[PDB]
Amino acid sequence: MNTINIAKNDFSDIELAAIPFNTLADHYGERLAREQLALEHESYEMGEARFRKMFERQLKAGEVADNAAAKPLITTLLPKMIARINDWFEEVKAKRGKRPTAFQFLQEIKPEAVAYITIKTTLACLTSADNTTVQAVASAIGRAIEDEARFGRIRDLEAKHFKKNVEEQLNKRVGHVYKKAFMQVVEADMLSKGLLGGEAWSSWHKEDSIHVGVRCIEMLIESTGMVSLHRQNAGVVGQDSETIELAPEYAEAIATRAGALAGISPMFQPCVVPPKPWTGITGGGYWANGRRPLALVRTHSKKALMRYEDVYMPEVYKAINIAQNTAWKINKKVLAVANVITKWKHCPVEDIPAIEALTAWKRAAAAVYRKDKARKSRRISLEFMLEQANKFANHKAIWFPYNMDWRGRVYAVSMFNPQGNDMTKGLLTLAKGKPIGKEGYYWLKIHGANCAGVDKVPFPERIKFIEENHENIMACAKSPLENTWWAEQDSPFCFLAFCFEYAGVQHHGLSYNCSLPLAFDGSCSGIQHFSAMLRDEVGGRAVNLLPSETVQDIYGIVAKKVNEILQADAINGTDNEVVTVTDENTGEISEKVKLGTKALAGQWLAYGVTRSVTKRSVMTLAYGSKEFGFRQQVLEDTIQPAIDSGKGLMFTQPNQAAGYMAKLIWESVSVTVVAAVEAMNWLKSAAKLLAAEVKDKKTGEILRKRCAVHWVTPDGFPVWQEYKKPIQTRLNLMFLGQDSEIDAHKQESGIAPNFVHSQDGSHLRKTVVWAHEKYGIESFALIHDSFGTIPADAANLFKAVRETMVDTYESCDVLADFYDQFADQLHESQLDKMPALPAKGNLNLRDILESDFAFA
DNA sequence: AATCGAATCGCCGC
RNA sequence: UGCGGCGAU
DNA sequence: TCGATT
Numbered sequence A: 001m002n003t004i005n006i007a008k009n010d011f012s013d014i015e016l017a018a019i020p021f022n023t024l025a026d027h028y029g030e031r032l033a034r035e036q037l038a039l040e041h042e043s044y045e046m047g048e049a050r051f052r053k054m055f056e057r058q059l060k061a062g063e064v065a066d067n068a069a070a071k072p073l074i075t076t077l078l079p080k081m082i083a084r085i086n087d088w089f090e091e092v093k094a095k096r097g098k099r100p101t102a103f104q105f106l107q108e109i110k111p112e113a114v115a116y117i118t119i120k121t122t123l124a125c126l127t128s129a130d131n132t133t134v135q136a137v138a139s140a141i142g143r144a145i146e147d148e149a150r151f152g153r154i155r156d157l158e159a160k161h162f163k164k165n166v167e168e169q170l171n172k173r174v175g176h177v178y179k180k181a182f183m184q185v186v187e188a189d190m191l192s193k194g195l196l197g198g199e200a201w202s203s204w205h206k207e208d209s210i211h212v213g214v215r216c217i218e219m220l221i222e223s224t225g226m227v228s229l230h231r232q233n234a235g236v237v238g239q240d241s242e243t244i245e246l247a248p249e250y251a252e253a254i255a256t257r258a259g260a261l262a263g264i265s266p267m268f269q270p271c272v273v274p275p276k277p278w279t280g281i282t283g284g285g286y287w288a289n290g291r292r293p294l295a296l297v298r299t300h301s302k303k304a305l306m307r308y309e310d311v312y313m314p315e316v317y318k319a320i321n322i323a324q325n326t327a328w329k330i331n332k333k334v335l336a337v338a339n340v341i342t343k344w345k346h347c348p349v350e351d352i353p354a355i356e357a358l359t360a361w362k363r364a365a366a367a368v369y370r371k372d373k374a375r376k377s378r379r380i381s382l383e384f385m386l387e388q389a390n391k392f393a394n395h396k397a398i399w400f401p402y403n404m405d406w407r408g409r410v411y412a413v414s415m416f417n418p419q420g421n422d423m424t425k426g427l428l429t430l431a432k433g434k435p436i437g438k439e440g441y442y443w444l445k446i447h448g449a450n451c452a453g454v455d456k457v458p459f460p461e462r463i464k465f466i467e468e469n470h471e472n473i474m475a476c477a478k479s480p481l482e483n484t485w486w487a488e489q490d491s492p493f494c495f496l497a498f499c500f501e502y503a504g505v506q507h508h509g510l511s512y513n514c515s516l517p518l519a520f521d522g523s524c525s526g527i528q529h530f531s532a533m534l535r536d537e538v539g540g541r542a543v544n545l546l547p548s549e550t551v552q553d554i555y556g557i558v559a560k561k562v563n564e565i566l567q568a569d570a571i572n573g574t575d576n577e578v579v580t581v582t583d584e585n586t587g588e589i590s591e592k593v594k595l596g597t598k599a600l601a602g603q604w605l606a607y608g609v610t611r612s613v614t615k616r617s618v619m620t621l622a623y624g625s626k627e628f629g630f631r632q633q634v635l636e637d638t639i640q641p642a643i644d645s646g647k648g649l650m651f652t653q654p655n656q657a658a659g660y661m662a663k664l665i666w667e668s669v670s671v672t673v674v675a676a677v678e679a680m681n682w683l684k685s686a687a688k689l690l691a692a693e694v695k696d697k698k699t700g701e702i703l704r705k706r707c708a709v710h711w712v713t714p715d716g717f718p719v720w721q722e723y724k725k726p727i728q729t730r731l732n733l734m735f736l737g738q739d740s741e742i743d744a745h746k747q748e749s750g751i752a753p754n755f756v757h758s759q760d761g762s763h764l765r766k767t768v769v770w771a772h773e774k775y776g777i778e779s780f781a782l783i784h785d786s787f788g789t790i791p792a793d794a795a796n797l798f799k800a801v802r803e804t805m806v807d808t809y810e811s812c813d814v815l816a817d818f819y820d821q822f823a824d825q826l827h828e829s830q831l832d833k834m835p836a837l838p839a840k841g842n843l844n845l846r847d848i849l850e851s852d853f854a855f856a
Numbered sequence B: 001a002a003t004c005g006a007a008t009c010g011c012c013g014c
Numbered sequence C: 001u002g003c004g005g006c007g008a009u
Numbered sequence D: 001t002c003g004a005t006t
């Protein structure tokens, strides 16, 4: 209940410690040392305040058991509670005579749930309610017990399949009362169908709700010493009451843990000196010896991190330190614009003045509810980014530490960082610029065209777009508030940043010093990498790996292929037929028309199929999506928005149209990018064979335990895949739910997306070192697929990102290297089942050097 | 037989 | 952890 | 749709 302040004797260490001060004062001076270490002192200070504010509000709301400081307390006490409730059940059954009142109520709820609801509600009542009476907390236990018994029978009983239809809207409800009002209208709806056996709940009375709680409190006192019984004015019939007090030893446990956790989570701020170079696993980035040291790899387990101690990966270490050394500064010009517009609009860009009815009304209401929370969540992120940009505005330069995820993608550590949204990217620019020159001016206009959404057109048409709109750009630069043209663009704040740089070149000529980050973003890198490994000519051209006519739109190509089979099916497709299907719950066979492919093609041609229908399906292919996943997508992306808007009259049966759409998209994407589909199948089959435990059926004994998946990337960064699952988990309807084996399903669902994400991270890192050593590039803007630098270095980074990818896949067969990692661990019975390596195609990688639109 | 499930990271909230 | 929402890729 | 889990 009362937590020590860490800052008084412990946060003072990081400012006074001589070794962190000296090692950083040696590099950059004593005065910057006191500023940087005070900034990190503030970083832990605001983080401590975040934990205390959350804990105080959780204490008031009764959600203290949901806080992480109470969690290890719950883990130890609660096995004792389930055994004590299970032992008392057998005691009463052995005893003759009438049962206690609480006995019949207790059996309706699962034994481990009885354990939970008592502890949390006793914690909730002892930390917030100000009433320590036994009677008041027993009724709170029993009322929450009657909740899980009455509405948990929907989840447990013959509605479990139907509960899978009501669970997500229950999860979308925020607050226990809102989750309650939804469960009441659900329960009445199901009773109208006889789904609960027609048995309506008889509400427990107030005397019954106390008896379940009283038996539950004293059963916690028998099992655990958490909670202690006291009597006041005993022997007086008018004033005899019993109170309940939380045990002091358990109070100090959560208080020490809450204090320990508060010093462990700091709010990461940018660095006013260049960040600490990484020499090992830990201690990089920020300079102080803090309570939470930065890890080079963000891992879930410490053991997965300590696997990185011995690996010699010098090129990985060099690339992270080069990215850290990139000097950034706040764009003051766009900050002046952003500081005034956000006062007037909740979102600066959202609203600019410019020239089944039962179910559809619920869906419209759910959109307004989702839009309302989306608005408040979007705004609070904006106010933090603006206050960070205002805080570091006056500094001549700021820096961002970098580390990596377990796949090797590199991320900035500060909460305000250049891998953020458009406004945050707009507020940030590089600090060390050079005179722009003719070539830099060319790429500055190309970057300006990309910010406007003119990325689908060749480079000369991008230049002509800028020069045609020359007067609009200078009008926006001179007065951004008077001309809202820049805000109507695809990347508005980043476009406004281009406008200021474009105006300065017009004012100061080609000698103008420009430090804007000019971003080159790969089109679809997962397919781009996959087509490079297996030499896919057709797939590579679709993702602009080949020098092409125009920019190749893979979404348009798939939509074009879809429209080919659509027109073929409208002529020679199947006719409609009548099929019989039954709901399992209703148990009644009904006859409905199954539309043939000729009718479904006519529906889709009437709607008009463009790249928008095929867009989301192509992106999710690298994440493992297939035909079934596309059906949900095209229903919610295209069919349902059409239906609500007055269109969708062609989609008489929307699920049959969506499934037909999903089949056509999958047939189109599989023949467009064949190496992508083939490679993710081969990786999935590999993780399949390793993640199985191989037992002979007769002996029932393992011949090969469950095996993780490990590969090393061309950079030299090792990566293991170690998806593990807990054995037991427990979930309540109105209350929050709270070694181990390998999750075989997660190993396959993740192997292909993580392998290709590990491939782009190496390519990003190898690009960074190649651009820094072969060319003179010192400033890098990196977002996974995006490569940014100053305009004077833009042409060289254009070459370096191509040169690294050609040099990588000409030197390494990463799939063959992947095979040599796991071939020894394969069981002998699994060897015949393994698919062979996919066949290499006729693609020449040297054409990537001549490809304009790969960008990567 | 019956059933189940169709990428990573960060912030905020419960 | 889980769930809700936001953002990045 | 589609094979793997349970």
Ligand SMILES: O=P(O)(O)OP(=O)(O)OP(=O)(O)OC[C@H]1O[C@@H](n2cnc3c(-c4cccs4)ccnc32)[C@H](O)[C@@H]1O
Pocket (backbone or CB within 6 Å): A521, A616, A619, A620, A785, C009
């Ligand atoms: O609209 P078009 O311009 O015509 O076509 P696209 O340029 O291809 O798409 P767009 O919407 O404009 O945003 C593209 C820009 O944001 C990045 N980006 C946006 N969304 C994603 C996603 C997914 C979102 C939902 C499921 S997965 C996954 C990886 N990267 C993404 C892109 O990496 C690019 O940088």
Ligand SMILES: [Mg+2]
Pocket (backbone or CB within 6 Å): A453, A455
């Ligand atoms: Mg776009």
